[PDB]
Amino acid sequence: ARVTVQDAVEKIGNRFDLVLVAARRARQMQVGGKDPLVPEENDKTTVIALREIEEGLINNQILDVRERQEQQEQEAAELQAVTAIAEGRR
């Protein structure tokens, strides 16, 4: 579905970073599978990762706040579930 990354490299003006961002976002859709933001058309996970980068909804900045927001909301799932040992012991 993707023959060239000439357009998905203008959001990131560097080839050696496009192969790092999309190499990491293209793992979340394979292990610990999150959801591809774009509607897939029977493609792999790689080319789906290179199709978000062109439309700005992924980059090296969004790809952390999208997650570190989750890394602590699971710690919001830590304390709020920590009440489960708070009310289970008394």
Binding site: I85, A86, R89, R90
Partner: protein
């Protein structure tokens, strides 16, 4: 009498960690044992007559009582095999008998000294204790336990002495507690621990 059955006889202690260290391995093998939370001033009768050394705990199985924190939790790991608790290679086995000796002689005195020590030692010990337990931080990243995949006895020497963390006035401080504090989420709520914990020792969890 006491050993008249094929059953055990454990004159355990309700607060003394020797009981709570033993009962973990004691119940982690799925064996029908008898709990008797008893005191030093007044334990049960059998705990003083057949126990010519009078320690806590004390396990008795059809031949004689076995009194120690080590001789007991060793006698069970060598007689009730499955699941296993100690490795096979004698190289990495006796070293697993070394951390247990570098804890009963290293982090035990920091508990008794905080039980009978002066006002500064209680934090001085808490000084040498709290930071030192942070000096062992990066260990847990590599291995899911104390340098061993399987749940082994060297871990059981920690958690009963990690369950009395704030009960004697301790709380963590510094960068990297998420590696050890998150680790406590992996050990403090196991069947070997959950069903084994004494409710008396629980109320200092809130």
């Amino acid at each position: 009498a006491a050993n008249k059955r094929s059953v055990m006889t454990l004159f355990s202690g309700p607060t003394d960690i020797y009981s709570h260290q033993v009962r973990i391995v004691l119940a982690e093998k799925g064996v029908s044992f008898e709990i008797e939370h008893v005191e030093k001033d007044n334990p049960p009768q059998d705990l003083i007559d057949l126990n010519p050394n009078q320690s806590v705990p004390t396990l008795v199985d059809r031949e004689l009582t076995l009194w120690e924190s080590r001789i007991i939790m060793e006698y069970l790991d060598e007689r009730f095999p499955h699941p296993p608790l100690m490795p096979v290679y004698p190289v990495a086995r006796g070293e697993s008998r070394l951390y247990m000796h570098r804890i009963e002689k290293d982090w035990y005195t920091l508990m008794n000294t905080i039980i009978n020590g002066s006002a500064s030692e209680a934090d001085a010990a808490r000084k040498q204790l709290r930071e030192e337990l942070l000096a062992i931080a990066p260990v847990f990243g590599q291995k899911p336990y104390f340098l061993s995949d399987e749940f082994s006895l060297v871990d059981c020497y920690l958690a009963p002495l990690l369950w009395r963390l704030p009960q004697l006035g301790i709380e963590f401080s510094g960068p990297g507690a998420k590696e050890l504090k998150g680790y406590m989420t992996r050990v403090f709520e196991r069947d070997s621990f959950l069903a084994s914990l004494t409710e008396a020792e629980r109320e200092m969890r809130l």
